């Protein structure tokens, strides 16, 4: 084993990430960066983190009957808020900005001329 | 082709947010003059 | 890829466009009032 008790199961048809602790004991204290976060839930061995779109991180130890397991760093970089900086997008952005600024400028010019 | 739709959607979201902010600035500009006129 | 969020982003974009149209109407209306 090599004291690598924490594992991650993925590629499920649903969107979520889960932590499985391979410790053959009960009341296995979970952690997150050296701190008490949540006590083990009995009858279940899969601690829950959330969705992969949230980009979970941090190292997760697992303290069983023996010493603490070596924490498993997790990194996710799913693009939810990634925009596309191709040739077309910049041109559209600049054109819309320029047109809006010109229209607002004409309006405020007429406002000044009136008042 | 879903990723392309995601990129286009977020780009449009940010662009229209910027346009809304510009409209708010212009609303303040006209409101000050309208209040000082009446 | 999961489409459960892309639809939400599309709805948000549509709402932003509606609000932009309303703000354009407001600004046109008040400038016209200043001119009348």
């Amino acid at each position: 084993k090599g004291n690598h008790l924490v594992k991650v199961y993925d590629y499920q048809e649903d969107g979520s990430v889960l932590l499985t602790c391979d410790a053959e004991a009960k009341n296995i204290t979970w952690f997150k960066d050296g701190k008490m976060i949540g006590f083990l839930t009995e009858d279940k061995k899969k601690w829950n983190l959330g969705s992969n779109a949230k980009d979970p991180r941090g190292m997760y130890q697992c303290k069983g009957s023996q010493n603490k397991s070596k924490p498993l760093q997790v990194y996710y970089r799913m693009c939810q808020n990634c925009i596309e900086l191709n040739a077309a997008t910049i041109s559209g952005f600049l054109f819309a900005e320029i047109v809006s600024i010109f229209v607002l400028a004409v309006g405020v010019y007429f406002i000044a001329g009136q008042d | 082709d879903t990723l392309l739709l995601q990129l286009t959607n977020t780009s449009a979201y940010y662009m229209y947010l910027l346009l809304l902010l510009k409209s708010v600035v212009y609303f303040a500009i006209i409101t000050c003059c309208l209040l000082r006129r009446t | 890829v999961h489409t459960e969020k892309v639809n939400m982003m599309s709805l948000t974009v549509l709402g932003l466009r509606m609000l932009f149209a309303k703000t354009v109407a407001v600004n046109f209306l008040l400038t016209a009032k200043l001119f009348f």
Binding site: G92, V103 | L5, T8, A12 | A21, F28, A32
Partner: peptide, 29 residues
């Protein structure tokens, strides 16, 4: 293809509507 063309339609329609309302308001005046 469709979203960009539809946004182009949005922009051109907004500009044309602004221009024609501005032209109508002189005429009724």
């Amino acid at each position: 293809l469709d979203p960009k063309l539809c946004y182009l339609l949005d922009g051109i329609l907004f500009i044309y509507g602004v221009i024609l309302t501005a032209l109508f308001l002189r005429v009724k005046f």
